[PDB]
Amino acid sequence: ELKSTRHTKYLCNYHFVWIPKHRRNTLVNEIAEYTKEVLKSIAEELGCEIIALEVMPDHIHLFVNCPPRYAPSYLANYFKGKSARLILKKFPQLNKGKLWTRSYFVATAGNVSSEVIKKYIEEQWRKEGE
Amino acid sequence: ELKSTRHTKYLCNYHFVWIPKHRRNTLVNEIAEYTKEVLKSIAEELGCEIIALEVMPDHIHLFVNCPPRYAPSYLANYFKGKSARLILKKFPQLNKGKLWTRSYFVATAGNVSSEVIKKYIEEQWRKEGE
């Protein structure tokens, strides 16, 4: 649902997709479980709400609702950068200094009706006064 | 359509809605015309593509596709802040303090298909190798 603050009404959902670097069977068993754990922890750190998270052997698909203060690029790099540091630190057998490739996919999600927009306008005028 | 930057593939659409501060008949005639002009210029300046823009007497509804480097809140405050400066400068009678209220509505938009995501994943593995 739409979230609010003193001066903002928002609903920002994004699909983030990225892949491990060397092998397609990287995120499995304990590695995959820890990856899910750290991504969840990073989400709460950023005040984000995970809608759905697929941690597959060869890719991650993170669908999350986030505060408007964050740029998609900032979020992608925070999730990828911090998770990589933690995951590589925990599993020594994981190769090289990089876990993820530098690329990622991001797509906004949502459908705003004319009714939602009209309601918002009327609420602001009711609030601010005419 | 989906776009691509240095290391990303993205679709970032946002709906922004905000209202003028004092009167519901603020954005009319020359003022409304100039407002539409400056908002379009700011979009161009930021590398954003306007999908739809309604400049009504009592509100602005800006639906835009933007680069992932921008936070929704930065966009709202820049579009609002720079347009206000330019509008207040061209129309001295808008004196009466701030042009806009400090609030705004922002919501992401999009319905990306699984085929697009699947293609992205395969393209990354084709480029990365295994």
Side-chain angles (χ1 to χ4, degrees), chain A residues 7-8 68-69, chain B residues 16-18 39 42 46 62 71-85 100-106:
Chain A
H7 295 67
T8 306
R69 61 177 180 272
Chain B
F16 292 96
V17 181
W18 70 81
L39 290 173
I42 300 166
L46 298 175
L62 171 66
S73 289
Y74 165 77
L75 292 170
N77 295 313
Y78 195 73
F79 270 108
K80 288 178 65 184
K82 179 159 179 178
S83 63
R85 176 167 61 72
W100 317 114
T101 65
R102 184 57 181 65
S103 303
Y104 65 83
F105 166 105
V106 60

Side-chain angles (χ1 to χ4, degrees), chain B residues 14-87:
Chain B
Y14 311 96
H15 283 277
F16 292 96
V17 181
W18 70 81
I19 73 177
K21 188 160 136 182
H22 312 283
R23 306 171 290 101
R24 299 197 68 158
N25 65 328
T26 299
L27 308 178
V28 297
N29 303 111
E30 289 78 21
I31 300 168
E33 291 177 53
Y34 187 59
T35 297
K36 205 210 193 36
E37 292 180 354
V38 301
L39 290 173
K40 291 181 184 304
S41 292
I42 300 166
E44 206 294 325
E45 179 194 328
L46 298 175
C48 297
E49 187 185 325
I50 292 168
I51 302 167
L53 167 63
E54 290 107 53
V55 173
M56 299 300 278
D58 63 352
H59 76 276
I60 292 181
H61 170 208
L62 171 66
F63 185 29
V64 55
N65 171 279
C66 323
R69 65 189 111 112
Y70 302 117
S73 289
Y74 165 77
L75 292 170
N77 295 313
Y78 195 73
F79 270 108
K80 288 178 65 184
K82 179 159 179 178
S83 63
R85 176 167 61 72
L86 295 172
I87 288 32

